Amino acid sequence: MFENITAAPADPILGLADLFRADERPGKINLGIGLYYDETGKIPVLTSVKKAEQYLLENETTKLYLGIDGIPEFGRCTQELLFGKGSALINDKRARTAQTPGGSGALRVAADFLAKNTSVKRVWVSNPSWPNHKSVFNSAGLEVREYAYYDAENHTLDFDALINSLNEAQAGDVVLFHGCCHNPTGIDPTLEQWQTLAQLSVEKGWLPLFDFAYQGFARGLEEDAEGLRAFAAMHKELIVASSYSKNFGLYNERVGACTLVAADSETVDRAFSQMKAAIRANYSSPPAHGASVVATILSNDALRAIWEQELTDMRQRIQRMRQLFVNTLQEKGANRDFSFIIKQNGMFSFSGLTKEQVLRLREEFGVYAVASGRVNVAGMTPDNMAPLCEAIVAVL
Amino acid sequence: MFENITAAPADPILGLADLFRADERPGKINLGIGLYYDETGKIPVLTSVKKAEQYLLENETTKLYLGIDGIPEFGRCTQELLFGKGSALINDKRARTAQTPGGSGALRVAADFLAKNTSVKRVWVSNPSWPNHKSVFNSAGLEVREYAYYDAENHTLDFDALINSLNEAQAGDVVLFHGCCHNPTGIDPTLEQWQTLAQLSVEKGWLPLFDFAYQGFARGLEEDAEGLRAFAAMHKELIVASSYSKNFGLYNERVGACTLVAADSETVDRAFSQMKAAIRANYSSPPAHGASVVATILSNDALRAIWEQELTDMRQRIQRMRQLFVNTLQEKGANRDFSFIIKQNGMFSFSGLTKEQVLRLREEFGVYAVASGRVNVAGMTPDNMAPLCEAIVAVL
Numbered sequence: 092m093f094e095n096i097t098a099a100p101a102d103p104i105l106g107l108a109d110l111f112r113a114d115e116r117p118g119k120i121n122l123g124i125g126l127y128y129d130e131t132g133k134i135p136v137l138t139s140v141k142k143a144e145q146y147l148l149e150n151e152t153t154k155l156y157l158g159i160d161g162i163p164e165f166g167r168c169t170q171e172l173l174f175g176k177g178s179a180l181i182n183d184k185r186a187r188t189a190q191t192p193g194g195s196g197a198l199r200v201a202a203d204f205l206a207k208n209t210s211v212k213r214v215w216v217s218n219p220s221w222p223n224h225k226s227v228f229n230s231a232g233l234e235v236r237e238y239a240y241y242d243a244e245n246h247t248l249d250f251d252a253l254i255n256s257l258n259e260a261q262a263g264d265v266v267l268f269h270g271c272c273h274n275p276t277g278i279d280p281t282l283e284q285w286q287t288l289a290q291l292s293v294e295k296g297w298l299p300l301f302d303f304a305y306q307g308f309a310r311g312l313e314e315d316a317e318g319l320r321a322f323a324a325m326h327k328e329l330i331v332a333s334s335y336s337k338n339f340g341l342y343n344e345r346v347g348a349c350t351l352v353a354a355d356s357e358t359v360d361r362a363f364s365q366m367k368a369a370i371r372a373n374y375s376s377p378p379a380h381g382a383s384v385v386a387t388i389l390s391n392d393a394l395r396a397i398w399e400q401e402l403t404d405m406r407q408r409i410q411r412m413r414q415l416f417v418n419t420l421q422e423k424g425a426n427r428d429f430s431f432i433i434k435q436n437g438m439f440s441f442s443g444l445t446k447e448q449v450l451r452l453r454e455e456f457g458v459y460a461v462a463s464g465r466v467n468v469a470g471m472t473p474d475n476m477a478p479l480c481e482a483i484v485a486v487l
Numbered sequence: 488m489f490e491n492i493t494a495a496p497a498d499p500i501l502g503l504a505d506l507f508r509a510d511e512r513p514g515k516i517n518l519g520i521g522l523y524y525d526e527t528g529k530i531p532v533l534t535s536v537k538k539a540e541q542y543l544l545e546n547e548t549t550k551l552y553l554g555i556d557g558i559p560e561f562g563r564c565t566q567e568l569l570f571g572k573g574s575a576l577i578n579d580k581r582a583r584t585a586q587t588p589g590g591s592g593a594l595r596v597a598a599d600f601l602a603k604n605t606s607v608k609r610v611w612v613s614n615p616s617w618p619n620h621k622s623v624f625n626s627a628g629l630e631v632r633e634y635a636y637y638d639a640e641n642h643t644l645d646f647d648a649l650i651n652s653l654n655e656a657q658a659g660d661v662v663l664f665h666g667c668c669h670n671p672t673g674i675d676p677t678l679e680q681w682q683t684l685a686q687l688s689v690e691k692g693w694l695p696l697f698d699f700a701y702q703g704f705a706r707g708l709e710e711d712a713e714g715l716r717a718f719a720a721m722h723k724e725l726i727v728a729s730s731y732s733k734n735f736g737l738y739n740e741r742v743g744a745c746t747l748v749a750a751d752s753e754t755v756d757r758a759f760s761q762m763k764a765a766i767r768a769n770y771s772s773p774p775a776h777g778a779s780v781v782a783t784i785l786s787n788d789a790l791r792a793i794w795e796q797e798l799t800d801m802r803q804r805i806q807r808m809r810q811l812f813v814n815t816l817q818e819k820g821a822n823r824d825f826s827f828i829i830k831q832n833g834m835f836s837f838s839g840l841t842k843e844q845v846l847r848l849r850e851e852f853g854v855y856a857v858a859s860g861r862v863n864v865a866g867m868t869p870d871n872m873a874p875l876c877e878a879i880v881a882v883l
């Protein structure tokens with residue numbers, strides 16, 4: 092039965108982790124997978140999280156299955172982070188949120204839901220994009236088309252090309268937007284670009300799907316939600332797949348959400364019943380730990396305060412490694428000007444290195460970056476900066 | 488886009504918990520969903536688990552993503568529970584285990600793997616079965632066909648009827664078996680029946696899929712794995728979807744596993760890689776908490792000891808309640824003779840009440856059982872036994 096199964100190709104991101112592991116080379120540097128490291132180079136558990144955990148340890152009395160859609164407080168809290176304290180979306184009971192296993196499972200849930208209940212035939216993702224997007228949608232039997240987005244030459248957002256390629260997006264097609272901190276580019280539309288995009292989609296008939304994995308790493312919690320919030324203001328229907336992996340460092344606990352928005356409560360209710368059905372036929376009910384952690388922190392002023400600061404610290408430290416990266420580069424040779432690297436948001440910079448250049452960094456110098464040239468700034472530290480900037484220079 | 492979405496029908500099981508939750512009635516009794524309750528009527532966290540949790544609280548230093556296939560040691564431990572500590576499958580490096588989100592997630596994972604990497608078209612499941620089985624398979628585009636299984640008049644396993652049913656199954660068809668504690672009947676094949684089935688499927692060319700959610704609830708850990716293990720000795724390939732929701736009371740942490748066995752390692756590897764791919768396109772990686780809990784317990788002799796005792800305790804308490812259930816019914820003037828209930832294993836009993844009797848039991852007495860007549864024995868207690876038993880009598 093399995094005789095003729097062809098090995099599949101390794102995840103272009105997950106893959107490298109393997110390789111990374113397997114490499115005995117003493118001074119290896121991992122800038123591939125998007126994980127936030129700290130000055131010491133470790134991937135720590137937030138203090139607000141350890142606190143929330145002790146709290147559960149002490150207060151949990153049952154491991155009783157959660158509801159298909161998970162922890163109600165969790166969805167409530169998610170809806171507020173997303174749309175804001177007093178959104179009409181909330182007051183009008185227009186949004187329903189399902190706790191899912193990471194932003195990843197949220198995407199899948201959304202896909203399955205779409206494929207099976209709407210006549211959505213294609214999904215438009217950006218080029219470049221996050222590698223896993225294709226696989227998720229494809230697995231649900233949806234077509235993935237790509238829309239232009241980055242200007243290699245100028246290291247920026249090519250609005251025209253953006254707009255010019257979406258012209259072929261039919262009405263009823265799904266258009267996927269990254270809420271903030273575009274992965275892998277780090278280039279986001281300005282509030283105005285967003286407002287335009289939002290006008291366009293309504294006019295053109297697209298269903299927006301927000302992939303929101305880095306809320307809080309660009310500017311701030313509220314600030315990072317402006318584009319969505321702008322869309323939510325003109326849209327009747329929307330989907331939001333969001334993750335808490337990064338902003339809470341709860342990577343392995345698989346904490347995410349899938350929010351469905353509809354013109355009205357009755358509609359969002361009916362529709363969400365089908366989303367629930369799709370989850371049932373999948374993993375049934377979601378993992379409690381992670382999300383409990385999240386709900387505890389977000390609904391306790393103190394822990395929340397602690398949490399907001401850790402996030403700020405996280406965001407700030409990445410910003411600092413950013414400027415230090417451009418400086419060290421310069422100060423170390425570098426033919427190219429890497430200044431554009433400072434105007435990018437999030438954990439990564441699309442460095443502009445070639446595929447052969449990255450192969451070489453790895454092979455020769457032991458630095459791991461993704462073949463697209465995407466580096467994880469959060470993985471840079473004062474201590475590895477030099478040796479890392481040296482390897483880059485030697486490959487220029 | 489959602490204007491026309493049809494509300495989905497309710498989950499015969501899941502949706503019954505809602506109904507339950509919503510009724511203001513004082514002495515309601517929940518005999519629906521399969522949860523273990525204790526003498527006091529609560530659904531507790533095992534102490535072995537609480538112990539393991541503290542341990543993690545204190546020793547976890549990162550929440551770093553797990554491998555797509557999860558915690559390695561967790562997989563190790565799973566294989567030994569399943570096959571033997573000792574087994575050839577293990578020595579021969581012929582089995583690969585992916586940690587998944589519940590036994591449910593493992594089923595979906597298997598379905599997706601099959602549907603896309605093999606020529607499987609149909610999946611055979613017992614009649615009756617666990618309702619969710621059809622939805623999961625149908626979602627992956629697989630056809631679900633049923634094979635006879637229960638002798639309603641006699642309260643037993645109708646073997647020839649089973650065998651004459653599967654005879655209709657083609658080579659290369661998947662045949663789904665419940666490892667032990669058949670849900671919803673509680674009737675499992677004798678070791679000789681298992682052996683027969685095993686020889687028969689090897690000859691007929693069926694790919695066996697074991698759904699193993701109740702290890703340790705029938706007779707014991709090791710003995711409950713006998714049918715599987717007999718299949719494992721004759722088969723080149725098989726799949727095992729196991730859950731730890733029940734034997735560890737880790738219901739909401741979503742702990743399960745999907746085990747793949749192939750003629751050999753070269754083959755199980757290639758194949759597993761396609762399984763990993765199917766996971767990547769799903770939730771990406773599995774939830775750490777629950778699984779770490781399980782791996783900690785199974786790894787430590789002390790903790791494991793404690794855990795096995797708790798499990799024998801749970802199993803024993805259910806055995807007791809069953810005896811008590813028949814006696815009380817008898818002592819309350821039941822028409823029918825319910826002794827067959829003693830010969831069934833696991834959490835449930837297929838009581839033989841009709842649709843209308845179970846409907847009546849609920850509206851009228853507030854006793855909740857599944858429309859199939861399935862009652863959750865683990866939900867009975869000495870304190871509710873009387874009232875429960877009186878409601879039944881009143882409806883017969």
Ligand SMILES: *Cc1c(COP(=O)(O)O)cnc(C)c1O
Pocket residue numbers: 125192193194195196221269274302304333334335336342346347770771
């Ligand atoms: C990390 C990531 C996700 C999903 O992450 P989870 O780990 O599943 O929460 C989705 N989209 C992007 C762009 C990501 O970077």
Ligand SMILES: *Cc1c(COP(=O)(O)O)cnc(C)c1O
Pocket residue numbers: 374375521588589590591592617665670698700729730731732738742743
């Ligand atoms: C409980 C159960 C499952 C899956 O349970 P999870 O909570 O998803 O681990 C699968 N099959 C049967 C027969 C079950 O009883």
